[PDB]
Here is the input.
Amino acid sequence: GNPLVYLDVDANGKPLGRVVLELKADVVPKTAENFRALCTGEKGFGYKGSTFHRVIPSFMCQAGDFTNHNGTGGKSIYGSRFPDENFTLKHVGPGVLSMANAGPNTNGSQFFICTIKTDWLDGKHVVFGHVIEGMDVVKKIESFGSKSGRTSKKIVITDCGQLS
Ligand SMILES: CCOC(=O)CNC(=O)NCc1ccc(N)cc1
Here is the structure.
């Protein structure tokens, strides 16, 4: 079935808990596989140690720039960037997992977790999963954001991997 992956998150060195995500490999296999492999670190690089660098309350929490740590970087398991696979899944509400980008066909490693329905992103960002467990943790992360996206605490993915 669809992979389950996890992110363990700290804020200023204090554990916040675990976010568990279902990846919709049935709908977006290429996009799901990229994220899965970046969680396990099996290609020799991935999310472990990277930060949530841009968090905007009542919008989303963004992470996954493990090359530049500022939202300019990251890379996929296929190459620097890969195309938009499809726009079949929509940004239906809180807990949706979607790819960050710099315009059409610029998916890398950066991703975001929505804290509201972001319907205006439909057809622009590829949705590929959702939160199974740990929305309380996501709401904690959200609470350390600001209008500008700057975080008031350093929010680190201390561990990540695949559960099934
Ligand atoms: C709600 C999502 O907001 C964005 O995605 C705003 N864009 C964004 O931060 N773009 C920087 C970026 C650069 C390279 C890659 N691969 C991905 C993203």
